[PDB]
Amino acid sequence: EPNTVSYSQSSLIHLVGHGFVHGGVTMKLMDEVAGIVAARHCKTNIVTASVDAINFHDKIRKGCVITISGRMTFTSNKSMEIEVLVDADPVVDKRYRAASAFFTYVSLNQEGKPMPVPQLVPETEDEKKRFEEGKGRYLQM
Amino acid sequence: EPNTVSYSQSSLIHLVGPGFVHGGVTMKLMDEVAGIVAARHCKTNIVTASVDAINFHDKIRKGCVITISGRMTFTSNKSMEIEVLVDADPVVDKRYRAASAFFTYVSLNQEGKPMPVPQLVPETEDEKKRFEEGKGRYLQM
Amino acid sequence: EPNTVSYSQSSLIHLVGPGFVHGGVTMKLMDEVAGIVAARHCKTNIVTASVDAINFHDKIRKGCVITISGRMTFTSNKSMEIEVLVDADPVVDKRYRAASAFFTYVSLNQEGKPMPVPQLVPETEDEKKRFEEGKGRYLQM
Amino acid sequence: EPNTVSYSQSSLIHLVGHGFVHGGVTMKLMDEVAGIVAARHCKTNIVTASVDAINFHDKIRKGCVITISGRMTFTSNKSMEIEVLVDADPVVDKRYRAASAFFTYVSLNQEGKPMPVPQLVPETEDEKKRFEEGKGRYLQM
Amino acid sequence: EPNTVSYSQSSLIHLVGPGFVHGGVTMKLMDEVAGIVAARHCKTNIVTASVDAINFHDKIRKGCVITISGRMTFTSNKSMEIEVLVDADPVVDKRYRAASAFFTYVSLNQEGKPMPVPQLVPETEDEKKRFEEGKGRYLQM
Amino acid sequence: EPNTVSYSQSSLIHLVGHGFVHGGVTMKLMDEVAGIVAARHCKTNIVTASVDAINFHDKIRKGCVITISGRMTFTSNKSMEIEVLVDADPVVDKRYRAASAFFTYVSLNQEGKPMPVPQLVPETEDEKKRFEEGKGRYLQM
Numbered sequence: 001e002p003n004t005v006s007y008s009q010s011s012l013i014h015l016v017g018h019g020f021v022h023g024g025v026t027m028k029l030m031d032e033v034a035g036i037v038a039a040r041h042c043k044t045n046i047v048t049a050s051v052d053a054i055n056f057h058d059k060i061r062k063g064c065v066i067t068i069s070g071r072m073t074f075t076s077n078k079s080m081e082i083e084v085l086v087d088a089d090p091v092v093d094k095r096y097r098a099a100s101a102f103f104t105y106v107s108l109n110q111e112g113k114p115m116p117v118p119q120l121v122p123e124t125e126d127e128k129k130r131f132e133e134g135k136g137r138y139l140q141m
Numbered sequence: 142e143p144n145t146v147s148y149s150q151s152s153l154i155h156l157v158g159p160g161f162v163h164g165g166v167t168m169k170l171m172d173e174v175a176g177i178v179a180a181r182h183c184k185t186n187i188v189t190a191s192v193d194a195i196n197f198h199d200k201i202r203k204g205c206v207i208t209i210s211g212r213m214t215f216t217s218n219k220s221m222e223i224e225v226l227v228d229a230d231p232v233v234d235k236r237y238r239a240a241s242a243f244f245t246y247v248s249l250n251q252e253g254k255p256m257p258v259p260q261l262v263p264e265t266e267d268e269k270k271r272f273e274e275g276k277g278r279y280l281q282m
Numbered sequence: 283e284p285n286t287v288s289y290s291q292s293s294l295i296h297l298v299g300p301g302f303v304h305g306g307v308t309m310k311l312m313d314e315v316a317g318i319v320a321a322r323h324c325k326t327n328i329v330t331a332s333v334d335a336i337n338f339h340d341k342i343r344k345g346c347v348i349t350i351s352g353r354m355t356f357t358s359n360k361s362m363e364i365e366v367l368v369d370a371d372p373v374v375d376k377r378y379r380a381a382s383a384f385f386t387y388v389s390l391n392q393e394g395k396p397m398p399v400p401q402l403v404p405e406t407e408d409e410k411k412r413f414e415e416g417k418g419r420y421l422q423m
Numbered sequence: 424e425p426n427t428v429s430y431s432q433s434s435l436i437h438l439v440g441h442g443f444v445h446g447g448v449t450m451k452l453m454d455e456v457a458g459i460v461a462a463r464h465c466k467t468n469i470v471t472a473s474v475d476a477i478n479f480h481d482k483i484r485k486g487c488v489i490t491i492s493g494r495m496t497f498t499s500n501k502s503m504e505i506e507v508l509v510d511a512d513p514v515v516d517k518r519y520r521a522a523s524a525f526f527t528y529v530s531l532n533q534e535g536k537p538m539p540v541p542q543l544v545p546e547t548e549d550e551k552k553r554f555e556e557g558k559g560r561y562l563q564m
Numbered sequence: 565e566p567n568t569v570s571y572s573q574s575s576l577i578h579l580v581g582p583g584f585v586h587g588g589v590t591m592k593l594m595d596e597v598a599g600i601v602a603a604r605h606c607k608t609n610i611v612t613a614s615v616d617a618i619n620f621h622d623k624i625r626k627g628c629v630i631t632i633s634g635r636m637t638f639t640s641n642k643s644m645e646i647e648v649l650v651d652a653d654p655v656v657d658k659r660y661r662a663a664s665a666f667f668t669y670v671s672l673n674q675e676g677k678p679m680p681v682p683q684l685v686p687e688t689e690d691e692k693k694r695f696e697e698g699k700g701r702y703l704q705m
Numbered sequence: 706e707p708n709t710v711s712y713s714q715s716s717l718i719h720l721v722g723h724g725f726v727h728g729g730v731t732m733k734l735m736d737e738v739a740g741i742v743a744a745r746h747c748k749t750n751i752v753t754a755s756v757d758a759i760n761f762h763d764k765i766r767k768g769c770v771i772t773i774s775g776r777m778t779f780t781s782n783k784s785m786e787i788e789v790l791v792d793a794d795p796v797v798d799k800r801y802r803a804a805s806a807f808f809t810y811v812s813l814n815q816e817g818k819p820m821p822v823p824q825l826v827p828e829t830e831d832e833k834k835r836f837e838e839g840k841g842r843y844l845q846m
Contacts, residue, residue, distance in 0.1 A: 010206070011154060012154045012155065012156060012206070013152060013153050013154040014153065014155075015153060015173055015177060018327055020329070022313060022314075022317070022330075023313045023329070023330030023333070024309065024310030024311070024312075024313030024314060024330075025310065027306065027309040027310060027313060028306035028307065028309060028310045029306070030306075031304060031305045031306030031309060032156055032304070032306055035304065035305075035306075036156060036206065036232055039232045039233060040232055040233075043233045043234075047302060047304075047305070047338070047341060048304070048305030048306075048338050049338055050335070050336060050337050050338060051305070051333070051336035052334065052335060052336070053332070053334065054332055054333035054336070055331075055332045056329075056330055056331060056332060059329070065151075065153070065177065091177060091180050091181060092180070092181070092184055103305075108341075112340070112341065159300075159582075161470060163454060163455070163458065163470075163471070164454045164458075164470070164471030164474070164526075165450065165451035165452070165453075165454030165455055165458075165471075166451065168447065168450040168451060168454060168474070169445075169447030169448065169450060169451045170447070171447075172445060172446045172447030172450060173445075173447060176445070186441055188443070188446070188479075188482070189445075189446030189447075189479055190478075190479060191476070191477055191478045191479060192446070192450070192474070192477035193475065193476065193477070194473070194475060195473060195474035195475070195477070196473050197470070197471050197472055197473060199535070200470060200531075200535065292770075293718060294718050294719065294720060294770070295717045295718040296717065297717060297737055297741060300582075314720055318720060318770065318796060321796050321797070322796060322797070325797055347715070347717070347741065373741055373744045373745055374744060374745075374748045375748075433629070434577060435577045435578065435579060435629070436576050436577040437576065437578075438576060438596055438600060455579055459579060459629065459655055462655045462656060463655055463656075466656045466657075488574075488576070488600065514600060514603050514604060515603070515604070515607055584752060586736060586737070586740065586752075586753070587736045587740075587752070587753030587756070587808075588732065588733035588734070588735075588736030588737055588740075588753075589733065591729065591732040591733060591736060591756070592727075592729030592730065592732060592733045593729070594729075595727060595728045595729030595732060596727075596729060599727070609723055611725070611728070611761075611764070612727075612728030612729075612761055613760075613761060614758070614759055614760045614761060615728070615732070615756070615759035616757065616758065616759070617755070617757060618755060618756035618757070618759070619755050620752070620753050620754055620755060622817070623752060623813075623817065
């Protein structure tokens with residue numbers, strides 16, 4: 001199971017206490033989850049190279065519990081792509097998709113450059129397809 | 142299925158940043174989850190009455206993600222008992238139980254005094270078990 | 283000169299405390315500046331719709347002061363694009379571009395849906411340029 | 424005076440700024456005071472082993488100054504018990520007891536296990552009695 | 565005994581976490597105590613007018629508990645002077661004076677301008693002393 | 706340009722989110738800017754020795770952007786004086802002077818005492834005059 005999607009899949013879950021949560025609070029939390037999955041996959045130092053298609057689908061209010069999930073989608077020789085999803089749940093009554101993004105993470109050698117990365121191996125058809133999509137987005141750079 | 146364990150079963154997941162985390166930080170996070178399961182159960186504004194047997198099974202190190210899970214175990218007339226379990230998951234390199242506590246919460250009217258509490262019905266045998274034991278601790282008040 | 287680039291041109295400057303700063307922190311600060319240029323432009327209460335092409339050009343180290351600058355580039359009917367640039371300035375010992383992003387913001391009425399947006403008029407050639415390119419990215423929606 | 428109750432007695436005093444202070448904020452602060460007294464008594468690394476009878480006597484509101492006092496009550500060979508009290512004072516007009524708890528602290532050797540602890544010596548009748556009570560609570564574990 | 569030094573004599577005690585603490589942190593905490601003694605004295609909403617002679621006698625290290633004490637020294641018609649003293653107490657291993665300042669505070673009406681201030685009556689000789697000197701500094705405005 | 710006023714001139718710019726900003730928040734931020742200029746001038750460890758004439762000219766409200774500027778004014782053999790200015794700008798419509806102060810910074814040797822400091826050289830008439838004023842304030846200690 002090392003270097004598979006299920007091995008590094010991670011989530012965080014937060015109680016967020018005008019009235020709605022800033023995009024920045026959400027972005028930061030999305031980057032932490034992606035960091036966590038990058039970290040589980042690599043076991044080295046890890047840093048955000050770029051972030052694409054941060055889309056806020058709709059607002060998040062005070063007293064929601066948000067579930068920030070991450071799954072690795074694709075790896076090049078020296079980079080990891082991680083899809084991050086954000087769901088929001090009211091503490092009284094249902095679950096809705098609030099944000100999503102693709103993070104590309106990099107692992108740095110002692111001179112601050114990307115180094116060879118363990119390769120993600122897509123096992124299911126879902127994973128093979130997301131890998132293929134990841135490859136596409138990466139070649140667009 | 143309101144007023145069941147499964148109904149208000151709640152958890153939070155936190156990346157531990159800056160190694161040991163001092164008990165105080167964990168306790169606070171345990172109260173957060175406890176608050177959430179209580180608000181889901183009774184739907185009123187909510188306050189902690191007492192906490193018992195906080196056990197730190199062992200230390201929580203930086204770079205762990207902690208799952209803080211909470212389930213209701215028993216309800217008295219005016220009070221609720223809620224078990225909170227903390228699990229620690231190192232990201233590099235082993236998952237273990239880090240802490241546990243029984244929180245007794247109290248539902249308040251819009252002045253001061255605590256109002257009566259919606260009853261909790263167990264369904265599985267283990268839920269039956271836990272309720273007795275819950276019952277038990279209460280009695281010793 | 284309301285509704286020009288110069289009108290709502292905004293920036294923040296932060297001392298980085300405790301070395302790399304994780305992408306998440308910078309992203310949040312980029313959103314803060316983006317929010318400020320948008321509120322200056324349209325004067326309504328303001329929310330982030332999406333963020334694109336967040337590029338981390340390279341790492342931001344502790345003991346840097348970062349200039350986070352934001353200028354509006356283009357306005358659709360209901361949306362605004364805002365370029366945010368992050369510059370890093372070590373205090374001891376070299377200044378460099380650290381990150382850049384295009385934020386699309388949205389002006390909201392006092393319920394939910396986004397209201398129409400005050401148009402942006404470019405004046406210099408470079409502003410003309412940037413607006414096209416802005417226009418461009420929008421189209422690809 | 425080393426290893427006596429008066430030597431390590433400590434307090435912290437905080438201005439706390441729906442309207443009432445969460446149990447978690449109070450618990451955390453109680454653990455810090457107990458940590459401080461454990462630290463004064465030992466002069467080694469120090470960690471919470473367990474917490475018993477956290478009782479919230481009544482609420483704490485914004486703009487109260489809280490006095491969190493700690494006194495060591497009992498020591499076994501490898502553990503310290505510390506009573507923590509929390510008083511709340513309004514900034515205009517009087518002082519009331521808000522919370523109390525017993526913390527048991529441990530000192531860890533380089534392999535993460537409790538090590539021999541300096542022994543508390545109760546000098547007054549009050550201290551001898553609290554020691555005896557402490558011994559009782561400890562044997563209950 | 566309202567409007568005496570003893571009436572509004574206030575202090576806070578803080579555990580310094582993460583070694584030197586930068587002046588800024590201490591200054592902020594000195595203002596907090598100053599605010600508290602002023603609110604106790606006049607009972608109106610309260611704001612700092614100026615601070616003088618902040619002296620850092622020497623450095624405040626991590627793992628110190630600091631006592632920040634404040635007493636009123638003098639009242640003009642519209643203003644109050646308040647001396648704040650900071651004491652530092654290492655927990656392991658020596659207690660010393662770390663900083664001192666004279667804060668002049670101002671009582672505000674429910675619009676803008678500062679309202680008149682309740683007079684302060686000294687009683688001990690040292691209080692007499694301090695009031696003159698207080699008087700003195702004011703005059704030099 | 707090393708050791709001139711322009712070389713170490715620094716600023717920070719913050720979005721501040723009863724309704725007005727505490728003097729303490731402002732003081733802290735003023736000390737950070739002064740620290741930054743002291744740091745640019747010295748390239749060694751740096752600490753606040755004292756602060757004089759913190760004057761709050763008028764209030765700062767939520768949703769203002771504040772510009773905290775620092776410029777070195779004077780150096781003795783072993784100390785640096787830095788003038789700090791604070792301007793406040795509403796996010797809708799103009800700029801006003803909110804606070805000012807003189808910080809004196811010191812650079813410490815390994816035994817915690819001030820060490821010889823690079824000398825500020827005033828190049829313009831404005832700078833020569835502020836130097837002279839700085840010398841005056843310093844001899845008053």
